[PDB]
Amino acid sequence: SSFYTVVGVFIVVSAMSVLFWIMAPKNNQAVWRSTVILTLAMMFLMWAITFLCQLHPLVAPRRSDLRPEFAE
Amino acid sequence: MTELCPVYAPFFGAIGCASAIIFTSLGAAYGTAKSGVGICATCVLRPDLLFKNIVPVIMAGIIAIYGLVVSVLVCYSLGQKQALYTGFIQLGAGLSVGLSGLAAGFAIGIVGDAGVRGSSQQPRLFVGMILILIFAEVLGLYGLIVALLLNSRAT
Amino acid sequence: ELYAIAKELDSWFQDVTREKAIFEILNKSNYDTNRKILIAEGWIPRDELATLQARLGEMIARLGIDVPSIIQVLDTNHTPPTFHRTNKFTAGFQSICDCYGIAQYREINAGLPTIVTFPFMFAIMFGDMGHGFLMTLAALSLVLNEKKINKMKRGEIFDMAFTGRYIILLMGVFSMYTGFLYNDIFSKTMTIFKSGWKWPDHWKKGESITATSVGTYPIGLDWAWHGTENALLFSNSYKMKLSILMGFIHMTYSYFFSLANHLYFNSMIDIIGNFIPGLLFMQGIFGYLSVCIVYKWAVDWVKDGKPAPGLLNMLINMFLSPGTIDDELYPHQAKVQVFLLLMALV
Amino acid sequence: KFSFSHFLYYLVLIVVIVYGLYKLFTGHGSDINFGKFLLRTSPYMWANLGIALCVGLSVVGAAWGIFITGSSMIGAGVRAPRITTKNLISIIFCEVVAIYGLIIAIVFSSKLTVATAENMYSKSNLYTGYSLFWAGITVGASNLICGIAVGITGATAAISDAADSALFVKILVIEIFGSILGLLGLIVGLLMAGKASEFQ
Amino acid sequence: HAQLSSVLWTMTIQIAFGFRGFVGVFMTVALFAMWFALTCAVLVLMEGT
Amino acid sequence: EKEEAIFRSAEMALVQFYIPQEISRDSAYTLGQLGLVQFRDLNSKVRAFQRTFVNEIRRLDNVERQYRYFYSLLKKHDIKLYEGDTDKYLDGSGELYVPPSGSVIDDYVRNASYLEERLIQMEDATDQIEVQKNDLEQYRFILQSGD
Amino acid sequence: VSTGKAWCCTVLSAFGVVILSVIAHLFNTNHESFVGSINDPEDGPAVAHTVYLAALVYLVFFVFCGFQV
Structure with a gap:
């Protein structure tokens, strides 16, 4: 799972955001197609950052206290 | 002993552990005393504002909580034959958090006194009080952050 | 006598307050004596203009005076008031923003972006599922019982909690999401997916082992980082770069409201003189840093065999010593770096 | 005229003078060997003192300016609570001062590494110890100075804005100058530590 | 927030896991009371604000 | 429909009200309980003490003074106000079709002016007798001392 | 007895039951986050049993205070 899985998730998130922007209820349309779109955007951005920092790490977990029964 | 691990190396670690809690506690004490004088002066007339005016002493307390955190973290990094590197790491963490929380507690005390007084005269000053007071708290927070960064390198 | 007063004094005060307010409004009318008319003026939303016309038509029917009662809407250069029509949900966010x-009349309302951005910055800073769950329960205790705490006296602190109940609800929910990404429920981590890090096959008790990257953790921080003595290094790198990236994104999104305001106010001069150069400056420095962070994550340095650049050192050298790129992040980085420096200067 | 602090100042001055004359006259002037003190002393004391004093003095200056201008603007806010949000840029620029110290502390903590005993007191390790020490002091003290200055200026700005909103604008320029001072301090600290290698 | 939560967990509730018997049960109950009181007070409320 | 005003503030229009002087009070009530008009202060450059309706405010402000004095007296003697929902039921707070108070406001002014003096009189009586009450209580406490 | 104390202890004991139950389960299943360290208790199920007993103590408190709600 290289960088392009982030792009794929971006694609599906963008599809959802455009779809909802089209289908936002008319009663509170601005509130809907602002709050839902911004939640999708920020949730995706934070997830992508969390995934990317782990994608090609420059630091690996390092500890001395791991109990040997968990080596499986 | 060794050149890297002198017998006097744990002195810096122990004194940093002491320094964190001590200076954060004096900062918190100044904040609590000043803001509590403000609260007691204010709430003679308007005791209804007790649970608003209590915020500055609470923030002073969280300063000492940051100091406690750092002191505990550096304390469990101490050892008899610990390196001089980790000794000065612990010293730097304790000194940074202590001095930062001391300054933050002084600022919190003064700002909280002024704020409780004003927000008793002018209720719209509550948000102003608290938003300045958080900006004073964040300085002790920054000192905590530096202490954590340093302590992450202890051994 | 005082008991007789108590049963009706409140209604007397309400009526007298209304009547005094009525005359204080009438003062703001120009009393034309020759025409024997109060020439009043007032701001009303245009969508409510019809309502005003209807209701005055109803009162004149009540009085039967058949007077013109002229609702003469007129053009003016005066700055109109800033009315934001807020539901119970967005009212708290509008109040805090x-x-x-x-806001300036008919400029972009910051409260609508705030609805999401304020709780979610709170969540990024807060970032625990146990504490986010506690906050969500606290908020729901106000939102589910909303009709009971409404029409009820609330004091001040509890009133502040109630008026922010949806603010606190979004804080709790986004904090649960953030703690999921931080992989924090209280102090402890979740182990719901297979870790991307696998420990060595065997080790002696007390041995300083190092994990190996069998993969990448799907969503959230890998639970293999829990309890590791270098957890702080990776967590700090992650959270610091997250702060920089998301702060840049939020600043850019808010700054584009400047472009939208200039477009709405037909102020192309603000677009060309303010928006375009400020945007170029902001991107060419800090958005450069942002795309640079994501690119550095996008490159497998250990596999490429190239030295991982000192990203903050490179940002510093972008200004204090241009051109002498220390570790080449990407080809022609010196030319692009000095071009961005010159563009920001220009 | 007497004060305990000045009494100790003069006492320690006299003691140091007498000790120096004693060492010099007996031919042991080289025993007071501040250079050998710099050589023998652990570089980590210098480095971690640099970081700790950087962030500590940055926070001291930030907090000092913060309570100056915050107390002034809360007092001025009693009649005009509108002053709070308008003059809060003063608190902001005071806090930015401490953020500078935090950034410099991060940069310098990147330099902290376990140097080998065989290479402990080399030219590079001593250089980086002194560099981090004095760069942290430079950034921290400049930040302390700038935070106090910005707090004084923002207090004056809040009070003037309470007097009249038109007087606020040109004092914000003074606050900008105060912030530029701290920014210059930060960049000079970066330049001082720019060529300082890690501990090796 | 992460470090305060971890330190509070270590100081308050994790100590109780080390003792057993009815003294262990009592320590678990009381130390959970302390842990939750400080979590709501210090972490959720004091630091959420 | 009414345009949502959350992305940008609602579009305002300035309305000039040509109100016949005879129906001014009723009209002011109508569009005040309607609740969508923010009035411009056309008389901003006229000193308040010489403004058009200053005396009508002054008499009602005296009435409000008298009512808050009554509230102070009720607190002094520990009586709780009714605070009934009759005003809430009458004032729709979202419905503009409510009739204003008639001549009853003049009755309020007269009643208030009379009743204030009535309360002053009886308060002075009760206060004077209470003063001599306290004085004679102190006298008794002095006399109760055996030695 | 009072409604305020009843609600406070009811809520605290509900969180006690839930959280100590899940902690006891994670100790009983030898979850790494609770047992994987040398510094953790050496025998998962043993401490799981006492955490479960504490969860039952908070269950008693929860049910009792419900009887006074």
């Missing part, structure tokens, strides 16, 4: 200051 306009406590700083009330």
Whole structure:
């Protein structure tokens, strides 16, 4: 799972955001197609950052206290 | 002993552990005393504002909580034959958090006194009080952050 | 006598307050004596203009005076008031955003972006599922019982909690999401997916082992980082770069409201003189840093065999010593770096 | 005229003078060997003192300016609570001062590494110890100075804005100058530590 | 927030896991009371604000 | 429909009200309980003490003074106000079709002016007798001392 | 007895039951986050049993205070 899985998730998130922007209820349309779109955007951005920092790490977990029964 | 691990190396670690809690506690004490004088002066007339005016002493307390955190973290990094590197790491963490929380507690005390007084005269000053007071708290927070960064390198 | 007063004094005060307010409004009318008319003026939303016309038509029917009662809407250069029509949901966010200051007439309302951005910055800073769950329960205790705490006296602190109930609800929910990404429920981590890090096959008790990257953790921080003595290094790198990236994104999104305001106010001069050069400066420095962070994550340095650049050192050298790129992040980085420096200067 | 602090100042001055004359006259002037003190002393004391004093003095200056200008603007806010949000840029620029110290502390903590005993007191390790020490002091003290200055200026700005909103604008320029001072301090600290290698 | 939560967990509730018997049960109950009181007070409320 | 005003503030229009002087009070009530008009202060450059309706405010402000004095007296003697929902039921707070108070406001002014003096009189009586009450209580406490 | 104390202890004991139950389960299943360290208790199920007993103590408190709600 290289960088392009982030792009794929971006694609599906963008599809959802455009779809909802089209289908936002008319009663509170601005509130809907602002709050839902911004939640999708920020949730995706934070997830992508969390995934990317782990994608090609420059630091690996390092500890001395791991109990040997968990080596499986 | 060794050149890297002198017998006097744990002195810096122990004194940093002491320094964190001590200076954060004096900062918190100044904040609590000043803001509590403000609260007691204010709430003679308007005791209804007790649970608003209590915020500055609470923030002073969280300063000492940051100091406690750092002191505990550096304390469990101490050892008899610990390196001089980790000794000065612990010293730097304790000194940074202590001095930062001391300054933050002084600022919190003064700002909280002024704020409780004003927000008793002018209720719209509550948000102003608290938003300045958080900006004073964040300085002790920054000192905590530096202490954590340093302590992450202890051994 | 005082008991007789108590049963009706409140209604007397309400009526007298209304009547005094009525005359204080009438003062703001120009009393034309020759025409024997109060020439009043007032701001009303245009969508409510019809309502005003209807209701005055109803009162004149009540009085039967058949007077013109002229609702003469007129053009003016005066700055109109800033009315934001808020539901129970967005009312708290509007109140917190306009406590700083009330928006210019018909400029973009910051409260609508705030609805999401304020709780979610709170969540990024807060970032625990146990504490986010506690906050969500606290908020729901106000939102589910909303009709009971409404029409009820609330004091001040509890009133503040109630008026922010949806603010606190979004804080709790986004904090649960953030703690999921931080992989924090209280102090402890979740182990719901296979870790991307696998420990060595065997080790002696007390041995300083190092994990190996069998993969990448799907969503959230890998639970293999829990309890590791270098957890702080990776967590700090992650959270610091997250702060920089998301702060840049939020600043850019808010700054594009400047472009939208200039477009709405037909102020192309603000677009060309202010928006375009400020955008070029902001991107060419800090958005460069942002795309640079994501690119550095996008490159497998250990597999490429190239030295991982000192990203903050490179940002510093972008200004204090241009051209002498220390570790080449990407080809022609020196030319692009000095071009961005010159563009920001220009 | 007497004060305990000045009494100790003069006492320690006299003691140091007498000790120096004693060492010099007996031919042991080289025993007071501040250079050998710099050589023998652990570089980590210098480095971690640099970081700790950087962030500590940055926070001291930030907090000092913060309570100056915050107390002034809360007092001025009693009649005009509008002053709070308008003059809060003063608190902001005071806090930015401490953020500078935090950034410099991060940069310098990147330099902290376990140097080998065989290479402990080399030219590079001593250089980086002194560099981090004095760069942290430079950034921290400049930040302390700038935070106090910005707090004084923002207090004056809040009070003037309470007097009249038109007087606020040109004092914000003074606050900008105060912030530029701290920014210059930060960049000079970066330049001082720019060529300082890690501990090796 | 992460470090305060971890330190509070270590100081308050994790100590109780080390003792057993009815003294262990009592320590678990009381130390959970302390842990939750400080979590709501210090972490959720004091630091959420 | 009414345009949502959350992305940008609602579009305002300035309305000039040509109100016949005879129906001014009723009209002011109508569009005040309607609740969508923010009035411009056309008389901003006229000193308040010489403004058009200053005396009508002054008499009602005296009435409000008298009512808050009554509230102070009720607190002094520990009586709780009714605070009934009759005003809430009458004032729709979202419905503009409510009739204003008639001549009853003049009755309020007269009643208030009379009743204030009535309360002053009886308060002075009760206060004077209470003063001599306290004085004679102190006298008794002095006399109760055996030695 | 009072409604305020009843609600406070009811809520605290509900969180006690839930959280100590899940902690006891994670100790009983030898979850790494609770047992994987040398510094953790050496025998998962043993401490799981006492955490479960504490969860039952908070269950008693929860049910009792419900009887006074």
